[PDB]
Scaffold this active site. Structure first.
Site, PDB file in Angstrom:
ATOM      1  N   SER A   1       0.801  -1.243   0.000  1.00 42.30           N
ATOM      2  CA  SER A   1       0.000   0.000   0.000  1.00 42.30           C
ATOM      3  C   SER A   1       0.841   1.305   0.000  1.00 42.30           C
ATOM      4  O   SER A   1       0.270   2.361  -0.256  1.00 42.30           O
ATOM      5  CB  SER A   1      -1.024  -0.010   1.142  1.00 42.30           C
TER       6      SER A   1
ATOM      7  N   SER B   1       1.172   3.242   5.655  1.00 40.83           N
ATOM      8  CA  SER B   1       1.434   1.863   6.027  1.00 40.83           C
ATOM      9  C   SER B   1       1.314   0.957   4.808  1.00 40.83           C
ATOM     10  O   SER B   1       0.655   1.306   3.809  1.00 40.83           O
ATOM     11  CB  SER B   1       0.458   1.377   7.117  1.00 40.83           C
TER      12      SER B   1
END
EC number: 3.5.2.6
Length: 243
Positions: A46, A184
């Protein structure tokens, strides 16, 4: 320096191999249990959403205002069952919304844009909406810190508006006039699994410290650890102190 020793003490009960890289525009500093991870390439996961958002806005494939409508079909998580802007989807880590952005960008443009900016190995394969989740795109923690440092300073090869918009999509919190921006990433679909917490701290006086937590993950690990560990390290270094 005792500061360096205090930071290494955080990694005592962290059984997983890990590295914490910092960058202030001049010096690269490595902390953690396995420092070679800093120069080792892993899938971005991500964390690629930062580059995906820049590429999409730069090439007029989306706006930061544009609402990506949820058709009504339940997604992998309950939290993704609603409409999202790119900024909302960045914080929620809404994979399908960014998969749609990637599909609008297409394989040719995505390929040339990653080569133009020099993002990691710059390889995407045949799956335009899976390359950051399963490979072949890989990037080092040293490449990650330099990329988000340039983002923070507006020095990436993108329009000032585009970088400023994407920069505020990463905004997590402020302490006085010290601002934390971060993203994150958990590369679940590869062995060994990779865990990311990449971002930067923008101080009141204009100084920037870009950072990158990179560690080995496994099924059943605590999802909150990457952020918590990164905040503890940033506190021990005097970069982002707790209030």
């Amino acid at each position: 320096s005792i500061i360096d020793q205090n930071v290494q003490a955080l990694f005592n009960e962290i059984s997983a191999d890990a590295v914490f890289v910092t960058y202030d525009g001049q010096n690269i500093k490595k902390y953690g249990t396995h420092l070679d991870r800093a120069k080792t390439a892993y899938i971005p996961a991500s964390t690629f959403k930062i580059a995906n958002a820049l590429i999409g806005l730069e090439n007029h494939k989306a706006t930061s205002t544009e609402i990506f409508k949820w058709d009504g079909k339940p997604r992998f998580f309950k939290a993704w069952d609603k409409d999202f802007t790119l900024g909302e989807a960045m914080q929620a880590s809404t994979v399908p919304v960014y998969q749609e952005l990637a599909r609008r960008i297409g394989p040719s443009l995505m390929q040339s844009e990653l080569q133009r900016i020099g993002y990691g190995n710059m390889q995407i394969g045949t799956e335009v909406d899976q390359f950051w989740l399963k490979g072949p795109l890989t990037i080092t923690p040293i490449q990650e810190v330099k990329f988000v440092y340039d983002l923070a300073q507006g020095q990436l090869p993108f329009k000032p508006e585009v970088q400023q918009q994407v920069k505020e999509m990463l905004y997590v919190e402020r302490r006085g006039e010290n601002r934390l921006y971060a993203k994150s990433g958990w590369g679940m679909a590869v062995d060994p699994q990779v865990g990311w917490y990449v971002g930067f701290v923008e101080k009141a006086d204009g100084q920037v410290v870009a950072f990158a937590l990179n560690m080995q993950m496994k099924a059943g690990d605590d999802i909150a650890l990457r952020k918590q560990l990164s905040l503890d390290v940033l506190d021990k270094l005097g970069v982002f102190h707790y209030l």
